[PDB]
Assembly symmetry: D2
Homo-oligomer: 384 residues x 4
């Protein structure tokens, strides 16, 4: 189960680089030099890395220091063959963003947030990134009167529209992906789920430039079915990028390694991505637990990729099995794929087999055979 | 705090009529005659009633029996002055719908589901309803392989598109509202939140005909902020109808009377509906607990309206208070309403006050004053 | 992976017999004759069956009808070799129990609840049951003023104390197990978790007669770690019985087949039960989904046992693996088993290696190696 | 609604002193000198302060520095009249505690954890504290194999037993209170709820020395009813201390000011504490949101006390109202307080009115009148 760069596994600098500071504890690990992270991830079989601006260039750095940091980074990429498919902006760590970036109540903060983003879009394009992610982690509220959400949505739309105008005017080939999260660090975060983000995109001036970057653990923080949500994003043509990790239910954002947390959900996610032919990066946004030393960090990162690859093999075996194909027909998955009324409205209304002469009791008595199908799925997942 | 029909409070027949059967217990109350419910609700100050087809006309009724039931209903409406602003279809109780109506795997069930709906749209228009609600309570799955969600979304779109074609072809003045719910009675339900429903509407052929009918308790079953979600629906121009009730957190759908459950959320909801000038019905989808006799049913229904009216008075007092208006300015709610960059992109990029000379430490040191504002809100809610 | 009666798998009559009525839908399956259920479960490899009084003897049955029903049941047990290890009382379905049985506000209902229980304890002993379960599903409240919980706990204690006096006075060899649940069908249920039930037992007059009967899905309805809770019950010597099923997170009680829901939790549960040598029944309290016909019911029941047996094999392989044993030592599980201060308090206080000369930075730098251990656990679960 | 020191409101140094570092952001406020916090809280009407060792004496401080810090603290207490009713140990911030203190897998860490605690018990007694709190925030796991929970419970018991031996041997008048939390910062924390902590205490060698210190938001992080849990702790005689704050549902630990979050739960909590005559401190463990400057910190702290006092007045008015007293009788709260069978077991068995001649249908038809009672409670809460 060995990864190759052709599997398109990517990692954020801030994942393996997380020093282990949590709300109640100090860091347990020294900081990693981004150049060291690039080399070590390349040795494990990764395809590329991602970054927030502030991960790569320390906040407040001089232009000269900024040049030096980018140059050393670019050399490690050249030395390893690693790519940078995605970048993003840190609009959440600095105290100035304590009430948000794009939807801060203070107008001068919103303007600064936009300028900070634009500078990193330029860098992202220079380094080859094809997706620019936005996680509005500070966009929200702890109390009801602090944020008029209609006004905040106007400001969020205004910011994204200005970014679309900028990339169009520069001629950049880059698309945006909004990353939803329901809460943490704000009591409630705006655009809390994949559905809310998808809905918001349709009100932007250039909707074609915007998709979603869903994260396993975030949708599970609302108790939602992550494969279902990904299916709706694919149906809408908006799955531009994805963040893979694990989460044990409705609690703080754990960012466990992929495969941890809800294992069956991970199986059904991989089944869907592979069946739909998703071609983008398989990005891991995870934190190696602070219990670990650096050997544990790399073991956790390796496990992310390993578990994707085991699940890929088991999902493929499931769909290839003639006994499963026959169970899918027994459960009428084939009929769900057929139109309800390709004959048209008037035909349906005149069809007495659809109402006047329909035997509801005979249809009702038919079992769906779903438990047999699901146990075949379980057997395949477990290799039994 | 006495309701009048001008407050536009409405109730479903199935609310005060709930007999108290739950997953673990038999009914505790006899069935109510819909004509009795109309008379009693009119005496309490309600404006109108809503219904599922099967609430009004028993399933399997003959055409003649159907005529008789509608006539007796219409007479109670004439006798009381009660209106019927909304109607809906029962696509969840009968065993035939056990895998869904619009997205059942069996094609003949989907066709029957559509014909059953169309028949009740005709009745709805005859009785004056201006909104037709769809709650796809059986649309979903307990297991991953049972439902290909992309195919199910194609079938859901196909059904709603056919309904839009029908109402257009008949010339009816009626709009559709989708009611989201995350789970129960299915393990996961399709279009689980307001955001997912809003996103789905934008892919229909005639999006103008479709909005949402959110329910307090349903969004709270995903741990989401209901006023925030309603703000996004209003921003999108899609809040066609609303279902008011109470819910204590993430658990089974309790359908408590409005004001019960999360009281502060109820305050912020009423503040928003009144400030935005929402003009539709204030519909209660609640269940009087099965501990109650019929006196308790009417006391619970009365409490729904009473609590809306107390919260309305307190929210109005909050917004009218000069001390609150001054706190809103101190927290820069006025600046959140102003454009970030009405001067345009090029101006922003050339503005050195927005980045090069912005003092982040001075902006960061400014308190938001949100706790003082929220305690003023609390004081107003509690009458202190 | 074929079950034998020596695996001690048991099923409640009400599980495979569930007709599929849920809050929003009618039954989808005909009722099963308990004699048919006993025969079919015996053919699948089950060891025994359990029952509520009202599952076996219809409520209101005459004494003569009661005799006939017990006789036919006993004959199926004799014909199949099936045992009845556990029984329980239905104190939740009938409307009289709408505010509880043992803690109903009405004193005459509490007295009836006790008499109904006592009658079935006699029957339970006659049929050989060694554990009597109590699930107080109606003991609780939807509102704060309806139930003084201190008074309700006095009444709960009074009821259980009287039952202990009864079984002692009759000389019966039977022990009680309390089954906790946090909510549903009441808004909040008394003794909501394993911890609360354990705490309550220590205040009874004869604590030795009482243990717990935890259920996978119930503890997961509070977001709690079920293996952890079972570990505390075993530590207390109180795990008298267990209910196995599956649950997808914090929502209504799904009662999925065992292995469904949180698969990793199921693995860690089986690892614990087998390592601790739990010797009681492996009882499944599950509902075959209402989508299923009777073939699906038996397929779901079979899957319960199958999944226990696959997980048993994988957990045994995990603990037998020398590479895992070495990882357990690397993570110092061996040191967690050793006393902290068997040398005593005075020794510890005089030990300068424990404080004055302890190198906190050297201890802090040691990795715990937990991610490597967990990936070995994952590899074993998946057969990789 | 002005607080006095006789209302026994207390605050932890770490509450108003929280600098605003969260998982995703830097501090927004400078550190507060504990002497300044004591003076400012005394001016607001507080009765006292609490502390972790590391809040008062910086970790690694020399003995001489330790003396100086305690002396300056003691002078502010003398100058203000503030008391120190409770103290606790920080066994969670330093990296050495990354796998726990009392239940760390490393034996030398467990020994250090005990020595660190003992040193602060001595200081606590010197400063007058009557309760010593333990929050085992690092006691737990992110993965199943990392912690054998039976062994960890043996180590937890061993630690608490040694602390009881120490305080007995020194002759100290101090009692212990365990503070439960279900998760955060560990994926699952041992003794996750009030019930689990109560159960664990009964296995200690000197149970009389140990109670609980429940926290509003922690029990609500498991979706549990906090007043119910407090009622069970009072019933057990174990409510030694309480932590008051607010929490919006099942998510990260928000530590909002008291009254925020679930307002009705706060009303029912205050009703219970006052009715039961709880005489200990009303301690606030809350965090002023990081959006706030120092004026906002003190406004948030003031709001904690204000909201307790408003709720106290409304709960007293509720219980004093003759119309409520009559509703309580109508709902048979008086009968819930009466014994079920003070006549004894034999009497109950011979009483044909309890079973043979009991009219279940007549009892079942009686309404409980709970909705009328609850609306009277709502009316009183809102001042209507
Ligand atoms: Mg995350
Ligand atoms: Mg992410
Ligand atoms: Mg509902
Ligand atoms: Mg509704
Ligand atoms: Mg259950
Ligand atoms: Mg059970
Ligand atoms: Mg807390
Ligand atoms: Mg606390």
């Amino acid at each position: 189960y060995q990864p190759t760069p052709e599997d398109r596994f990517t990692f954020g600098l801030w994942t393996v680089g997380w020093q282990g500071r949590d709300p109640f504890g100090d860091a347990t690990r020294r900081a990693l030099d981004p150049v060291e992270s690039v080399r070590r991830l390349a040795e494990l079989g990764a395809h590329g890395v991602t970054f927030h601006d502030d991960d790569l260039i320390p906040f407040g750095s001089s232009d000269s220091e900024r040049e030096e940091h980018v140059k050393r980074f670019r050399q490690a990429l050249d030395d390893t063959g690693m790519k940078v498919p995605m970048a993003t902006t840190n609009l959440f760590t600095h105290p100035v963003f304590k009430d948000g970036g794009f939807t801060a109540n203070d107008r001068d903060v919103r303007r600064y947030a936009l300028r900070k983003t634009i500078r990193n879009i330029d860098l992202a394009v220079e380094l080859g990134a094809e997706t620019y992610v936005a996680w509005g982690g500070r966009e929200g509220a702890e109390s009801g009167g602090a944020k008029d959400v209609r006004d905040a949505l106007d400001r969020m739309k205004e910011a994204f529209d200005l970014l679309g105008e900028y990339v169009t005017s520069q001629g950049y080939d880059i698309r945006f992906a909004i990353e939803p999260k329901p809460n943490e660090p704000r009591g409630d975060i705006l655009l809390p789920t994949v559905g809310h983000a998808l809905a918001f995109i349709e009100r932007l001036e250039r909707p074609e430039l915007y998709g979603v970057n869903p994260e396993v653990g975030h949708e599970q923080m609302a108790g939602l079915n992550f494969p279902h949500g990904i299916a709706q994003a694919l149906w809408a043509g908006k799955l531009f990028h994805i963040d893979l990790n694990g989460q044990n239910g409705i609690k703080y954002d754990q960012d466990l390694r992929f495969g941890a947390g809800d294992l069956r959900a991970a199986f059904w996610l991989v089944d869907l991505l592979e069946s739909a032919g998703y071609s983008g990066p398989r990005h891991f946004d995870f934190k190696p637990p602070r219990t670990e030393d650096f050997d544990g960090v790399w073991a956790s990162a390796a496990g992310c990729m390993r578990n994707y690859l085991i699940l890929k093999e088991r999902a493929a075996a499931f769909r290839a099995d003639p006994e499963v194909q026959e169970a899918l027909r027994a459960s009428r998955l084939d009929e769900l794929a057929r139109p309800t009324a390709a004959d048209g409205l008037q035909a349906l209304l005149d069809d007495r087999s659809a109402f006047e002469e329909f035997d509801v009791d005979a249809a009702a008595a038919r079992g769906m055979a779903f438990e047999r199908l699901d146990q075949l799925a379980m057997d395949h997942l477990l290799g039994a």
